[PDB]
């Protein structure tokens, strides 16, 4: 929420400058590899019908956001778990020493993991997380919502990701880095610092997506 405003400000700033209206666009000049995200959502599934949204992060961990506002995370050692109650109460469990209080939720989470692992592609497969801050911790899904054109994912670390259904283009916005990772229809990705896009500009496609982005942040912000 404090971070959504940072983003909002950042997007207001880059959109306000009409990046695609420069006499000459020098998009490659806005690139900044030192900003590459650490985590993003590589794949997801929706059971918000009877349970919730299951998703996998880039580092292969799997997480679930249940309709009852609780989150269960399974780290990539296929065993360590972290349950997060609505009030924010965090607690550690292990699938090896599978509890009794969450057997149902662990079995569900195991079903999603198997499903995402059998049918789903891994977004950003060709991206390499950066050697970012080490005191930073793995984020969980804060909240998500869909539109007719895209899905919007809000991560506890401040990042917001928008996956567009039709063309498969994605955006990964980080208010801490003040950068945007764009993944075009050809699966090629690039990271830019928003202030630089403000200076050098960008193409029509990235710009309309940054306008749609301020819109979705506004929706996240007023909910």
């Amino acid at each position: 929420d404090c971070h959504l405003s940072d983003m909002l400000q950042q997007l207001h700033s880059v959109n306000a400058s009409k990046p695609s209206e420069r006499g000459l666009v020098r998009q490659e000049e806005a690139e900044d590899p030192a900003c590459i995200p650490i985590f993003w959502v590589s794949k997801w599934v929706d059971y918000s019908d009877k349970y919730g949204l299951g998703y996998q992060l880039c580092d292969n961990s799997v997480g679930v956001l249940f309709n009852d506002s609780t989150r269960l995370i399974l780290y990539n050692d296929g065993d360590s778990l972290q349950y997060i109650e609505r009030d924010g109460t965090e607690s550690y469990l292990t699938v090896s020493s599978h509890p009794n209080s969450l057997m149902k939720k662990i079995t569900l989470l195991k079903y999603f993991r198997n499903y995402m692992s059998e049918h789903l592609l891994k977004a950003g497969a060709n991206i390499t997380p950066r050697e970012g801050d080490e005191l930073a911790r793995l984020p969980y899904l804060r909240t998500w919502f869909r539109t007719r054109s895209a899905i919007i994912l809000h991560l506890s670390n401040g990042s917001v990701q928008i996956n567009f259904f039709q063309d498969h283009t994605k955006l990964i916005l980080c208010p801490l880095m003040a950068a945007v990772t764009y993944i075009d229809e050809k699966r090629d990705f690039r990271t830019y610092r928003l202030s630089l896009l403000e200076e050098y500009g960008c193409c029509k496609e990235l710009a309309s997506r940054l306008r749609y982005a301020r819109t979705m942040v506004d929706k996240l912000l007023s909910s």
Binding site: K43, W44, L120, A123, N163
Partner: peptide, 6 residues
């Protein structure tokens, strides 16, 4: 869609 890209 109900899940991300296959």
């Amino acid at each position: 869609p109900l899940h991300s890209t296959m």
